[model samples]
Target chain A: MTGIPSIVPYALPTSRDLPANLAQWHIDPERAVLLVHAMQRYFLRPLPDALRDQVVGNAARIRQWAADNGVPVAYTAQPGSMNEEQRGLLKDFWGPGMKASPTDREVVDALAPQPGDWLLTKWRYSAFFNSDLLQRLHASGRDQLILCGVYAHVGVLISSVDAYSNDIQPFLVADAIADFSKEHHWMAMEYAASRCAMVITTDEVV
Target chain B: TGIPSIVPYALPTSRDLPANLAQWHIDPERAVLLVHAMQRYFLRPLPDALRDQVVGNAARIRQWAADNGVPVAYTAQPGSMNEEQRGLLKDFWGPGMKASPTDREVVDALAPQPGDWLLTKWRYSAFFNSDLLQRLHASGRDQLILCGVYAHVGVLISSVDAYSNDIQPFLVADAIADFSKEHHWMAMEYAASRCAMVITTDEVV
Candidate 1:
C-alpha cells in the first residue's frame, strides 16, 4: 500500500490500561479546548467497523461533555488534493493524500462541528503548525487541550508534544483515539504519558 | 528512573537501513550538525561497546563538521533544575541531572568546541524552549543533520520538529544510539519513512 495500511479492529484502552501521568493536570472547562482531531471520512475509512464506531462514539461523548461544560471545541481537517509543494515532505510518506471531496474531507456526522466551534486547517502531524491554535489558545488564556481523535501515534501524539513545548498542557483522551494497531496505540499512549501529556480514558474524561 | 538502562547492541549499518522516502541531499552550506543530548547521565546506561561505537561515530561526524565548515550545535539538559523551569518534564523523569559537571556535561569524546552552539534542552525535541531554531534562522541554515543519544526520543522528535518547521533533517543512522537495537532501528525506520532522510555517518563525512 502507498498510504496508510489496512488497520484491524482492536479494543480501545480503558482506565485500567492507562499509564500513570507524571503531570497532575486536570481538565478545566473554562481553561481547556476540546480538539476532535482529523475525524474525516477518508482517514476513518480504513478502520474496521467496531473500531470506528467505538472511537467516534467515545469522541462524541467527550464532545457532548465539552458542550455541557462550556469548553470551546476545535476540529482539525486536512484540505485534500494538495499539490506537490503544498504537500511538502508529507507526500513522500503518504502519497497524494485524500481527494478534495466531501466524502474524503468532511468530518464524521456524529461529532460534526456546531456554531462557535473552531475549525483548524491542518497541514502536518501537528495542529499548531500552519494554524492559529496556539495564538488563539494563548489569546483566550486557555492552556489545556483535551485531544481525542484517530491515529494515536501520528497526529495526536505529535500535537501533544507541540502543546507541551508551547507551555500548554495536553490531555490525550486515550480510548477515543484509534491507531494502525493495538501495539501502536499503546505505544503512543505510553510515550505521551511518560514524556509529554496526561493520558485518560473516555470514561475518566466524561 | 526515567531513562532506561540500555543493553548493548550492534549499531546499524547502511545495509540494514530502511528505505527512505525523502530524496533530499545534505547540503553543507545549508546544513547544521546537531549533537543531541549526549550527556554523561544519558550515556551512562549504555554498554561500553555500544556507547563507544555510536559516540565514536558521532565524534567523527563532529570532526567532519569542523573540516567542512558546517556549524555544530549541542543540546544538554542542565542538572539541578527546579519544577518551574523543568515544567512537565519533572513529572516524567523526576528531577533530571544535578547542577554538576559530571551529570550535565556532554560526553568527553563529543564535547563542544569554542564556536559550537550549546543549547539547554527542556524536552524531547531540541527545538523545544531552545534558541536552536532562531539561531539556525539567523545563520541562514535550514537543513539539520541530527545525531546523538537515545535515537527514538530526542533525536527522532527533533527530526520531526525540524521537518514541521520547514527545515530538512538528515538523521545520521549509525551515529545515534537507543535503548536497544530494536528501538534504534524503530527510530530510523520512522524517520526514514515519515519526516527525515536517514543518512549514514559515512555519507556526511
Candidate 2:
C-alpha cells in the first residue's frame, strides 16, 4: 500500500455517504481511463513541499499501476497561460496566465505521459470543458474515469460532477489528490462521495 | 460609486473568497447578481426569519446592483415539469409537481424590472436549457453574485455550471437559504474552496 498525504487527514466515507451504483460499476481496463489532472508545476508549485511531493508521488504510483494493468491513461494539461477571450470570466479571478516559466504546465517527470497515453487539451476545470475528452472517451467506449488531480475541491470535484452528469462513473482516487488544506480537500471528497462519485483510496485502485 | 469595489467594508464582513472583495466586493462593471428561485413556493417552506433574511438581502442586492449599474438576473425552476424533462429531480422531490400561482413569480420585494433578465429553467442549474449563459456572454460579464433558495441544490449546480463556463460565482453566504443549516454550510464550504467566493450582505451593500 502507498502512503497517503500527511496533511490529508483520515476521511473514510460516512454511513450515509455511499455510492449507489458503485458496486455495479467495477473497474475494467477496457471501460476505464486513469485521469492525471493538472499535474503541471503552475498549479503544483503553490502547495507546501510535503503535499506537493505526496500528490506527485501517489499519482506516479497510480500511473505505474495503470500502465502495468494495461488500462488507458489520460491527462488534462492547461497551457502555461490564458487570455481573457480564451478564459472568459476567469481572467477576473486569476487575472492573467502564470506566464510560461521553465516548469510551467509541465506534468511532473515521474508521471509524464508515456507512449499511447492520451493528453487531452485542458481549457477549464472540467476535463470535458470545451475539450474533446468526452468525444474521445465515447469514441473509445470508456465510461468510467479514475480521477486524481490538484486542488481536489476545484478541478477534481467539478470534473467528477461533470462526469456523473454525463453518466460516466467517477472514481475519486482519494489519496491521489491534494489541496491547500485537509478541510478543503475533504470537502470535495465528501461532496463527491455523497453526491456524484465513488470515493476510493489509492490502495483500492492500485 | 458602483457599490464601492474595495476590500473590507466597515459594515461587514477564503480561497473561495475572491482576492480582495472583502465580504462584499462588487465587480459591478463586470458582474451580474443572480436571484435564484425566490418564488413563494420555495420561500413558503422556510422558517420566517431565514426566508425574510434571504428575501430582504436579495432585494437589497438587487437595489444595490441597480444603483451600481450591475445587471440583475433571476432564475426559477418551472413548477410543472414533465418526467422526461424533469429527469431524476422528479424522484428526488417526488412526482405530481405542479406550479402554484406564485411558484414562478419573484416575490413582490425582489421583482425584476424591465431591464432585468429573468430565466425560466427546467433543471437544477439555471444554465441548462436557458439563454442565461448566452445573455451573460453577450453582456461580457466576468462574475456572478448568487442569492436565493436551496443553496445546495439549484444554486450549487448553477455555481458549478458557471465555473465550468469560466464565469466566476460569488455566493452571498448570508443571503442564500437552504433546507438545513448543515446543507447550507456544506454548500458554502464547497463554493468557498472550489468554485465561488462565499460572501455576505453587509460586505456588499
Candidate 3:
C-alpha cells in the first residue's frame, strides 16, 4: 500500500511572510482551517525545564506561521484521552493525578487554530481514531494531509499509520514533529518512510 | 470432545531460598549447592515449610490435591549431601548415596508413581535450555499446567515460551510470586494477554 499521487505539501513561511500558496490548497475555505493540536501536558507535566523552552518556542513558531499563512488552527484535549483502555494504560505508567482536560488555551496561544477551523477532539493515539478527521477531510474533498505534531513516535506515527490504513495520503513535516529523544524522532520518520510516506523538512516542504 | 485431557509435565519450585541466603539467614553455600544440584539433576525445588507458608497461605495444597484424587509428585533435597550431580534425574534418584550414581536417591524419596513423566531441563525457561516439549509429546500430553516459583521471571518467561511452542498453559497465579511485586503483576498481565488462562487452585477445581 502506497500513498495516493496527491501532492503532499507544507509551508516553511518566515515570521514576516505567511505563504498564500499553502493556504490556497484547501479547496473548501471553511475546511481549510489550519489544524494545530496542543501539547501542554508534555510541556508542563512530565517535560523537564531544559527541553520545555525548545518545545514551547517551536509551538509558538508553528502558531505564528499558521496565523500569518492564513491557516486555521484548532486543538482539543490530549489525544491520550481517547479511550478508557488508553487512559488506564497511561495512568498505570504515569499516575492517576495526571489531568485529562484539554490544554486548548496553551496550544492556541502557542499555535492558534482559527475561528473556522474544526477543533476536533480525539481520545486515541491516532487523530483519526474515533474522530471526525476523515469524515471532515472527505466532506471537504481534501486528499492530502500535511501532518506536524508532538512526539513523532506516539501521535504523529500513529496518525500516519492510521492515515495510510484508511487510504489517506499523509505527508510528514519532518522538522515539525518533536520528541523527547532525537532517536525516537528518527525512528518514527523511518517507520513512516518504510510505510511509503514521504518525509519532508520545513524547507523542503516550502 | 472425547479426547483425553492432556496433562503435561508440571515442574514446581520455590523462590524463597535466594533472598534468605542473600540475607545470611540461610546458608548461602548450601543454597548454591542446592541450585547446582537442581541444575545438574534437572529437578526443580519445591518450597520447604516456612517459605511455602509465606506464599501458599497454608501449604496444604499437596495434601488437598492428594485427598481430592489429584495425582501429586514430590522430591526432597538433602540439606547437605555428597552426590555427583549429572545425567537424567529419574535415573539419578535411586537407593544408596554414592558419589556419581546413576540417579539421586531424591527421586526414590519422591517415589514418582507409574505413568508419571520425568524430564531434565537446563536454564530458567523450561522451553529454552531443555527438551521438555519432546518429553511431554512422548508422554501423550499437549496441555501444560504451570505453577510455583518466581512469577515474573522464571514461571512467566517459561509460560510464554510454552505458548509460542503451541502448548496450552494453565498458570496458577497465586501459586507463583516473585521478588518484586511490580514485575509479578506485569508478567501475569502479559501472560494473560498472550493466551495462558490465569487461574488459582480453587478456580481450577
Measured against the true two-chain complex, the DockQ scores of the candidates, in the order shown, are 0.55, 0.21, 0.01
TM values, all candidates: 0.91, 0.74, 0.40
Q: Given candidate 3, what's the lDDT at residue B197? A: 51
Tell me the whole-model lDDT of each prediction, alpha carbons only: 0.88, 0.72, 0.43
Q: Compare the candidates by TM-score and give the number of the best one.
A: 1
Better of 2 and 3 by lDDT: 2
**Over the stretch B135-179, how does candidate 1's per-residue lDDT look in tens digits?**
999999989999997798899899988987778899998999998
- Encode model 2's per-residue lDDT on A1-206: one tens digit a residue: 00112343334333244344322346777788898988877767677676676667778888898898877789888875566678664554445655556477778786789988998877776777887788878998998899988768777877877776666778888778876577767777776765567788777787
lDDT of 1 by residue, A85-192 (tens): 878777767888988899899999998999999899888888888898998898878999999997788889999988887778999999999988898899889878
- Model 3 misplaced stretches (Cα beyond 4 Å): A1-35, A42-76, A79-88, A100-108, B1-205
In model 3, chain B matches the true chain B with a TM-score of: 0.50
Worst 10-residue lDDT window for candidate 2 chain A reads A1-10
Cα lDDT of model 3 by residue, A9-69, tens digit: 2222232332111112222233333334435453333344444445445555655655666
Q: Candidate 2: lDDT of A176? A: 82
| Residue A127 in model 2: lDDT | 79
For TM-score, candidate 1 versus 2, the one ahead is: 1
The CAPRI category of model 3 is incorrect
Candidate 2 on B1-205: residue-level lDDT in tens?
Answer: 0111112111113233334322334588888999987887677677776677778888888899999998999887667767666554432345423576656577888888998988886655777678889999999986889999667767887887887687788888778887776667777766664467788876678
TM-score of 3: 0.40
Model 1 regions more than 4 Å off: A20-24, A81-83
